[PDB]
């Protein structure tokens, strides 16, 4: 099995900056899983981030290190091999978070969302650049529906075509198990919840970049990093491929004895 997108697939993602919805699991299969999670979510016993009020904490963040079915979920043959077609088969995932919906939040307007970390500014993302120029900072965004997301419920907003437009609603409506996969900075705005108050939307988001980029840059000696970010037991997760930098902290087993082995196709 294999499920590398098709040059035209990777030609479409390439003029939008995102491409979806594309089928993780089934939706009776994502939900019987989330039904699992939701409740290993509660046990923070091996969580790598202690408690806080942070958003690493609220929003738990890096789930995929301490859970084992969020850990096969990062792993995941029909997110990787879609990943790889895009950046390369060399593939880390250096986060993961939730990203729920409640009757009565706002949705938001159409913005571009950055990498660097909010209560400090650093960057958390680095790619590798030539001399003078500016390095990119972008990570290929795996958002995968663990309940509906619908219009209803405030799903995202994208828009075709690529601070500029060029030569001239659009929901991202999602079942159980669907994901759209996107770049983090691709121009997006997402609706208000007007549904019922027991209709939650539940999102999972899955953060890649490929070996050759920096996470957590600098961070030499750190482990409070901000935003109840502790390094220490962080590690981003070679999913396929192999490593052939070592610059970054990496984690080949989770906190609960998961085996991380690198895909190949």
Request: aromatic content about 12%; hydrophobic content about 35%.
């Amino acid at each position: 099995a294999n499920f590398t997108f098709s040059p035209e697939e990777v030609a479409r993602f390439e003029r939008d900056g995102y491409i979806g919805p594309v089928k993780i699991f089934e939706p009776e299969e994502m939900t019987r899983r989330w039904n699992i999670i939701r409740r290993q979510l509660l046990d923070r016993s091996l969580a790598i981030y202690p408690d806080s009020n942070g958003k690493a904490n609220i929003s738990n963040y890096d789930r995929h290190l301490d859970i084992d079915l969020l850990a096969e979920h990062i792993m995941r043959p029909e997110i990787v091999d879609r990943v790889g077609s895009l950046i390369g088969r060399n593939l880390l995932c250096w986060r993961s978070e939730f990203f729920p919906k409640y009757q009565g939040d706002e949705g938001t307007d159409w913005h571009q969302a950055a990498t660097f970390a909010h209560a400090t500014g650093k960057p958390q993302i680095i790619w590798p650049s030539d001399e003078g120029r500016p390095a990119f900072i972008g990570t290929i965004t795996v958002w995968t529906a663990f309940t509906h997301s619908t219009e209803q419920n405030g799903c995202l907003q994208l828009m075709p075509g690529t601070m500029n437009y060029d030569e001239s609603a659009y929901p991202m409506v999602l079942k159980p198990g669907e994901a759209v996969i996107f770049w983090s900075n691709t121009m997006h705005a997402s609706l208000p919840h007007t549904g019922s108050k027991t209709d939650y939307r539940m999102g999972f988001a899955a953060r890649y970049v490929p070996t050759q980029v920096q996470v957590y840059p600098g961070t030499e000696n750190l482990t409070e990093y901000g935003d109840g970010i502790n390094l220490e037991k962080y590690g981003a997760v070679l999913t396929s491929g192999v490593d052939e930098y070592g610059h970054n902290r990496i984690a080949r087993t989770s906190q609960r004895g998961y085996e991380f082995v690198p895909r190949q196709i």
